[PDB]
Amino acid sequence: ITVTKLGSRIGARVDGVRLGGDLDDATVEQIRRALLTHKVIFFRHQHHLDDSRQLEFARLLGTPIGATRWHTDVTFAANYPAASILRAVTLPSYGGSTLWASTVAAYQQLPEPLRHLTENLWALHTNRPDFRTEHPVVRVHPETGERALLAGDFVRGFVGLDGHESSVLLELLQRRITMPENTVRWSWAPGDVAMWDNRATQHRAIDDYDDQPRLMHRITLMGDVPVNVHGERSRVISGAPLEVLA
Amino acid sequence: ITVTKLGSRIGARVDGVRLGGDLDDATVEQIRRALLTHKVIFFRHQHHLDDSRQLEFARLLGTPIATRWHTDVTFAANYPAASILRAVTLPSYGGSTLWASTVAAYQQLPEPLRHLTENLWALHTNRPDFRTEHPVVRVHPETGERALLAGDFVRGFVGLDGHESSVLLELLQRRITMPENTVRWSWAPGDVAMWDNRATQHRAIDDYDDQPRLMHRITLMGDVPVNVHGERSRVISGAPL
Amino acid sequence: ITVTKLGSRIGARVDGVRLGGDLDDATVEQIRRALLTHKVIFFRHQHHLDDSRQLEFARLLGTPIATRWHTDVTFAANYPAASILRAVTLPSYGGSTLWASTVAAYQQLPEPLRHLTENLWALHTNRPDFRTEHPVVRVHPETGERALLAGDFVRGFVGLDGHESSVLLELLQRRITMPENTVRWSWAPGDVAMWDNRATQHRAIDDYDDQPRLMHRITLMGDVPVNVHGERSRVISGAPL
Amino acid sequence: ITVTKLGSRIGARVDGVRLGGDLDDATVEQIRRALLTHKVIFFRHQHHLDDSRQLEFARLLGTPIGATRWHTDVTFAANYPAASILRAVTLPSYGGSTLWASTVAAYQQLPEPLRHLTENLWALHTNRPDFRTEHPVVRVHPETGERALLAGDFVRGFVGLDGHESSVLLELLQRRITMPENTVRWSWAPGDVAMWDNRATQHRAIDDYDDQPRLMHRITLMGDVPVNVHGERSRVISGAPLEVLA
Ligand SMILES: [Cl-]
Ligand SMILES: [Cl-]
Ligand SMILES: [Cl-]
Ligand SMILES: [Cl-]
Ligand SMILES: [Fe+3]
Ligand SMILES: [Fe+3]
Ligand SMILES: [Fe+3]
Ligand SMILES: [Fe+3]
């Protein structure tokens, strides 16, 4: 099993692994560490995979649950996902790459004033079945302790700020998060599988394949409610917790 | 001596006072307090004033030293404490002046923007090359009130890029110059305004079609800002006033 | 009857007039012209006025129908032409009102922003669900002057995303409410203001600490905007006024 | 010789060509058309190339002349470059990808109001030897007739706009231009060569290789002074024209 960095702040390729439910503990743990360290990892040549085997693999790393704007998944809910595992099924003849950004790297690049701002800022995330959650803008990752910015396209405003202030500040933060130095863009080939840490990233689909057929299979793993640098938790304004796969 | 509020967060008219250098301690003190409380105060019917008498008055309150919103001379580290401004020749229309309370603006900031501004430094410049890094929140040395320090001399914030600085400065200026924080004075003959430059910004208004307009200003020495953490402004370039 | 400018680009005081329904054609006409020229006009010493007499005056000028900058009822397609506003009960301080000339603001636009605004549509809404797509430049039906149409009822511009709309609207509002384009009136008992809603925005100011304040407004029917290319506003939802 | 699209709005790979000064007219022309159509093209496996052969090739397509912000090259000059040809010499073990955006695609995605704005807008581009040029924000490409946005990191302001307006509008335009649907990101392998149309693109280096050694060789081809949609030309405020390779 080898892990090779794809860039300075994000991304790694993991080789010498056949994904499935039969991986030993040492291998699952090596994978877990690579995920947490590199934020998004890629396995190539996984042509043996189907839906069931992908699910069997997913169960080893977490509890499975039941596009072209930058976002963190389902952040309108309080207990939004920890991670997802995504395999290519049918790919277009061109385009169709995917972007990830490290929101840990983004936080690390913030100068002190913007650290003080974001560590003391709350965003309303919504899906508009009405989900509204006030999340902190800095989250302390529950497995690594690393601070990560929490924002993305589900943010509708910041508490205490007016609509214009919120629009300007959100875009300032998005501009920083999605700086290319914080990002990896993956050109999918058949057999590829991506896994990302949704507590430490945003991602974005790209509509550059002229609507040619494209099919991916995603399995998403249950996460927990964010805690900020002061130990404060996200507040549910409206909506229910996300639930495991039935 | 009476002090009459002109608005909730800023401005008062002081009546029953003949400005000059012969005012007693009690009266000079009441004037000082009105100024610190109301941020800009106005005296009407001061027709006896000339440059000499204005200066004699000014000396009781301190040591004597357009159309963009600014705090005076903030490209310098020890920028002025206050100014005293008399109408001499007024246009037949227009020519009003605006002041904003930067104390009021700070008090209206929600918690996130307090945490931002209390940890933020702005570079102020006059382009003699004056460049000073001032804190964005200054603690008034006489009242203890916190005031936003920004305005048109700001060229950027330390650690932010040019676009971030442009957007943030305008966000802070939009807050500071909200009309609830401002008083606009239409000058009549004999009017004098005095403002606390440690707690305000002001702005001339170009709405008199360049008719002749003459005012006489006397400016009083101030000290170097202290921020909420006790830190002082940093001279990058230039000398003290 | 005398008309005195208050500023270069906006505002005049009309003296020598006792407002009411018994004014002759000549006087009603001079008042109409002063209004169209100066965008907002003020009458002082109108202590004889009551609701009935204000309405009788209003009927000579048209057909009778807070703290954010807006043009009245622009979420409707045929929004008002003008309003007439009388002080009834005034606070002991604060309580001034601001008007901006959107004609002046249009005239200050450089060529690129004229090309933008002359080809721009804004969605105005009241959230009865009123939604209207208005042009951002309207051609005044009586004067032919071009005026910016924007303000706080704007929710977005057709073809722009939410962030673009937020940034552009604020850019246009920053231009419109530049103090050179505005008049701020401190109300005294007996004061009446009348403004042309086709050529202005206005804004109440919350600087009187919620002391009691009562004004009486009468609003006059207007028509549907025409833009520089002859195009009319589009009702998306709601009825005509 | 084959040309394969890499994405809907930008980028193509050209195969079955050995780059050099010996290419026949038909081949040079096929290359020219591919460049103008796809805005940036890539040739792989060119391990025979050295500086001299790259130059011999460049001479077939134009007249050769004498990083991590998005820009169009040398736009502070009036007659800024038409195109560049870039080969990898020494590559880092990770990171080091390059981004291009199509400013033709960007113009095509503008809604009517922003077309009216930009077609009637002028930007001051500067290098701060003092180069200052007022360029139109829409340029009509001299070979294809296509309209392209002209902006990027050398813009210091727009004529008639104040500093804040200019900052906000430039970023609005950059945000549109650099939307991922308008972009291609190339992971360099040894032997790769990129050629881009500088009249129809912006590009950006990415600092994500932790300053490992990296060496590219660039040859840049002379361009001409922009003309806008009204037939108006760029204005030299200060500085000299760019000059051919001595
Ligand atoms: Cl491979
Ligand atoms: Cl990218
Ligand atoms: Cl005002
Ligand atoms: Cl290959
Ligand atoms: Fe997603
Ligand atoms: Fe000043
Ligand atoms: Fe109103
Ligand atoms: Fe370059």
3-state secondary structure chain C: CEEEECCCCCCEEEECCCCCCCCCHHHHHHHHHHHHHHCEEEECCCCCCCHHHHHHHHHHHCCECCCCCECCCCCCCCCCCEEEEEEEECCCCCCCEEEEEHHHHHHCCCHHHHHHHCCCEEEEECCCCCEEEEECEEECCCCCCEEECCCCCEEEECCCCHHHHHHHHHHHHHHHCCHHHEEEECCCCCCEEEEECCCEEEEECCCCCCCCCEEEEEEECCCCCECCCCCECEEEECCCC
DSSP SS3 for B105? helix
**Contact check, Cβ <8 Å, B4/C93:** yes
**CA distance linking residue B6 with residue A238, whole number of Å:** 44
| Structure-derived torsion over alpha carbons of residues C162, C164, C169, C171, reported in degrees to the nearest 10 | 150
**Contact check, Cβ <8 Å, A163/C167:** no
**CA distance linking residue C166 with residue A152, whole number of Å:** 17
In the block, tokens 């996902």 appear at: A81
**CA distance linking residue A152 with residue A201, whole number of Å:** 10
**CA distance linking residue D155 with residue D124, whole number of Å:** 6
Per-position b or e across C116-154, b if 16+ CB within 10 A of its CB: bbbbbbbbbbbeeebbbbbbbbbbbeeeebbbbbbbbbb
Of A33, A45, A69, A218, the catalytic one is A218
Query: Of D87, D143, D58, whose CA–CA distance to D66 is shortest?
Result: D58
Angle CA(B196)–CA(B198)–CA(B201) in degrees, nearest 5? 75
Which residues does B234 contact at the CB level (< 8 Å), separation at least 6? B77, B132, B133
In the block, tokens 């970023």 appear at: D171
Residues from chain B contacting residue D168 (CB–CB below 8 Å): 166-167
Structure tokens at B76: 């310098």
Instruction: Please give the order of strands across the beta sheet that includes B40-43.
Output: B2-5, B12-15, B40-43, B192-196, B82-89, B214-220
Best D108, D115, D117 member to test C by mutation, with max C CBs in 10 Å, is D117
Q: What are phi and psi of D123, to 5 degrees?
A: -115, 140
**CA distance linking residue B178 with residue A19, whole number of Å:** 60
Structure tokens at B176: 């500071």
**CA distance linking residue D195 with residue D70, whole number of Å:** 17
**CA distance linking residue D234 with residue A191, whole number of Å:** 51
Residues from chain A contacting residue D175 (CB–CB below 8 Å): 171
Asked whether C229 and C129 are in contact (CB, 8 A), the reply is no
Structure tokens at C48: 């004889």
Distance (Å) from CA D186 to ligand 2 centroid: 9
Q: What are phi and psi of D168, to 5 degrees?
A: -70, -45
B147 DSSP 8-state letter: E
Beta-strand runs (E) in B102-233: 121-125, 131-135, 137-139, 146-148, 154-157, 182-185, 192-196, 200-204, 214-220
**Single-letter amino acid, residue B61:** L
Q: Which stretches within chain D are classed as H helix?
A: 25-38, 51-61, 103-108, 112-118, 163-177
Structure tokens at D138: 């829409």
In angstroms, the Cα distances linking D164 to B126, B160, C107 are 18, 15, 20
Helix (H) / strand (E) containing B165: helix B162-176
Residues in chain B whose Cβ is within 8 Å of chain C: 4-9, 67, 92-94, 96, 98, 170, 174, 179-180, 184, 203, 205-209
Query: Of B105, B129, B75, B87, whose CA–CA distance to B181 is shortest?
Result: B105
**CA distance linking residue D98 with residue D19, whole number of Å:** 21
**CA distance linking residue B41 with residue B185, whole number of Å:** 10
**Contact check, Cβ <8 Å, A171/C163:** yes
Maximum Cα–Cα distance for chain C, whole Å?
53
Burial of D19 (0-12, 13-18, 19+ CB in 10 A): buried
**Single-letter amino acid, residue C148:** L
Per-position b or e across D203-227, b if 16+ CB within 10 A of its CB: bbbbbbbeeeeeebeebbbbbebbb
Best A135, A165, A177 member to test B by mutation, with max B CBs in 10 Å, is A165
CA dihedral for A109, A112, A115, A117, sign (positive or negative): negative
DSSP string computed for D91-145: --SS---EEEEEHHHHHHT--HHHHHHHTT-EEEEE-----EEEEESEEE-TTT-
Query: Of B163, B153, B168, whose CA–CA distance to B74 is shortest?
Result: B153
**Single-letter amino acid, residue B22:** D
**Single-letter amino acid, residue C111:** E
Domain ranges of chain A: 1-246
In angstroms, the Cα distances linking C15 to B80, C28, C59, C191 are 43, 13, 20, 11
Query: Helix, strand, coil shares of chain D as percentages rounded to 5?
Result: 25, 30, 45
**Single-letter amino acid, residue D54:** Q
Asked whether A95 and A103 are in contact (CB, 8 A), the reply is no
Instruction: Please give the order of strands across the beta sheet that includes A155-158.
Output: A155-158, A122-126, A132-136, A235-238
Helix (H) / strand (E) containing A203: strand A201-205
Length of chain A: 246
Q: What are phi and psi of A44, to 5 degrees?
A: -105, 165
Structure tokens at C144: 């032919």
Asked whether B82 and B194 are in contact (CB, 8 A), the reply is yes
| Structure-derived torsion over alpha carbons of residues A28, A30, A31, A37, reported in degrees to the nearest 10 | 140
**CA distance linking residue B171 with residue B113, whole number of Å:** 10
Q: Which residues of C are catalytic?
A: 70, 72, 202, 217
**CA distance linking residue B141 with residue D36, whole number of Å:** 66
Which residues does B29 contact at the CB level (< 8 Å), separation at least 6? none
**CA distance linking residue A222 with residue B21, whole number of Å:** 77
**Single-letter amino acid, residue A31:** I
CA A183 to chain centroid, in Å, comes to 12
DSSP string computed for B31-78: HHHHHHHHSEEEE---TT--HHHHHHHHHHHS-B---S-B-TTTTSTT
Length of chain C: 241
Q: How many CB atoms lie within 10 A of CB C47?
A: 8
Residue of D nearest to B173 (CA): D164
Query: Of C71, C94, C82, whose CA–CA distance to C40 is shortest?
Result: C82
In the block, tokens 């009476």 appear at: B2
Residue of C nearest to B91 (CA): C7
Structure tokens at C7: 């500023």
Query: Which ligand places an atom closest to the C-alpha of B180?
Result: 3
Angle CA(C190)–CA(C192)–CA(C212) in degrees, nearest 5? 65
Best A4, A5, A8 member to test D by mutation, with max D CBs in 10 Å, is A8
D234 DSSP 8-state letter: P
Q: How many CB atoms lie within 10 A of CB C66?
A: 9
Q: What are phi and psi of C111, to 5 degrees?
A: -50, -50
**Contact check, Cβ <8 Å, C207/B93:** no
**CA distance linking residue B124 with residue B130, whole number of Å:** 8
Maximum Cα–Cα distance for chain A, whole Å?
52
Burial of B231 (0-12, 13-18, 19+ CB in 10 A): exposed
Residue of D nearest to C165 (CA): D172
CA dihedral for A166, A168, A173, A178, sign (positive or negative): positive
Angle CA(C156)–CA(C162)–CA(C164) in degrees, nearest 5? 90
Q: What are phi and psi of D35, to 5 degrees?
A: -60, -50
- Chain D: nearest CA to B202, how far in angstroms? 20
Q: What are phi and psi of B35, to 5 degrees?
A: -60, -50
In the block, tokens 């130059």 appear at: D55
**Single-letter amino acid, residue C36:** L
**CA distance linking residue B35 with residue C95, whole number of Å:** 22
Q: Which of B6, B94, B174 sits opposite C93 (nearest CB)?
A: B6
CA dihedral for D99, D104, D109, D113, sign (positive or negative): positive
Q: Which of C110, C120, C167 sits opposite D113 (nearest CB)?
A: C120
Asked whether A225 and A205 are in contact (CB, 8 A), the reply is no
The coordinates were experimentally obtained by X-ray
- Chain A: nearest CA to B73, how far in angstroms? 25
Q: Which stretches within chain A are classed as H helix?
A: 25-38, 51-61, 103-108, 112-118, 163-177
Distance (Å) from CA D127 to ligand 3 centroid: 40
Q: How many CB atoms lie within 10 A of CB B206?
A: 16
Per-position b or e across B107-144, b if 16+ CB within 10 A of its CB: ebbeebbbbbbbbbbbbbbbeeebbbbbbbbbbbeeee
CATH architecture of the domain with range B1-241: 4-Layer Sandwich (3.60)
**Contact check, Cβ <8 Å, C8/B93:** yes
B119: left (phi over 0), alpha (psi -120 to 50) or beta: alpha
Q: What are phi and psi of D73, to 5 degrees?
A: -70, 135
Helix (H) / strand (E) containing B174: helix B162-176
Residues from chain B contacting residue C93 (CB–CB below 8 Å): 4-8
Q: Which of C110, C115, C160 sits opposite D116 (nearest CB)?
A: C115
**CA distance linking residue D14 with residue D3, whole number of Å:** 5
Query: Of D40, D76, D31, whose CA–CA distance to D204 is shortest?
Result: D40
In the block, tokens 């809910």 appear at: A77
**Single-letter amino acid, residue C215:** M
Q: Which residues of B are catalytic?
A: 70, 72, 202, 217
Which fold, D1-246? Double-stranded beta-helix (3.60.130)
Residues from chain B contacting residue D171 (CB–CB below 8 Å): 163
